[PDB]
Amino acid sequence: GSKVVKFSYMWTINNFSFCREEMGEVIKSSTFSSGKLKWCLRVNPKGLDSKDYLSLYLLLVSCPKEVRAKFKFSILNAKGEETKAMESQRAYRFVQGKDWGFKKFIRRGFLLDEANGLLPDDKLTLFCEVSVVQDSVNMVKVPECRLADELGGLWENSRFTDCCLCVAGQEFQAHKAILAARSPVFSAMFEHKNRVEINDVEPEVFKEMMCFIYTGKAPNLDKMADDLLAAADKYALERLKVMCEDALCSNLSVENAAEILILADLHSADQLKTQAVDFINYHA
């Protein structure tokens, strides 16, 4: 017979109008699943190439080595009903990293005309429904990946450490291999006597940077975004740098924009600067 799993995903993008994405550029949403597949949506604000449209796609992000699926995209209005729906006429074949969708989902001009009301408060709300079909001829619970947490313990308990990092007097124990694998700046030092001096980062900010290096996370980033941005920059931890940019971006206010702009120039935080420049003009 058949097993058919149906699920939904809602995606709201604020200040859609101000999305400076140019033709070809993409915005990726968060992942979602039916509830062992992991999906997500990709949108091209100015077409994939016909740039007078929005390109919308459904991407299979992760899965255990193929999946058939029918999909339907639409836009929700203020009352929460669908409008402008496009649906696949059949189920398409997906594999990890594969996507399917509509190059010409909807015309910008139409989406931007306030007469149609698809952007209440300038917020675009995309809705996606998926239907996965499988032949009978999922039942095994597999634990989530715990790589980050186990490597995190390596730093939190100083197990099998091999080098010492002296931060403004304080001695911290770490693993060279891990630091080098994760930092080009650190990799450069260990490529040219197991004791490294650091005087550009404050201890507290250091512990958090290290937490990122060992686990890809930084739980306390919010209370030290500016200092972490600078620390991330000096040690070429590009992703962490961007995470701090996002934290600073959502703090922009008339009172702090100028300061945040200066900060972004000094640490070559391209996304933060643009956002700051834009924030300041809209308030000139």
Partner: peptide, 6 residues
């Protein structure tokens, strides 16, 4: 009309 960027 369904298509894939990949």
């Amino acid at each position: 009309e369904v298509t894939s960027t990949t």
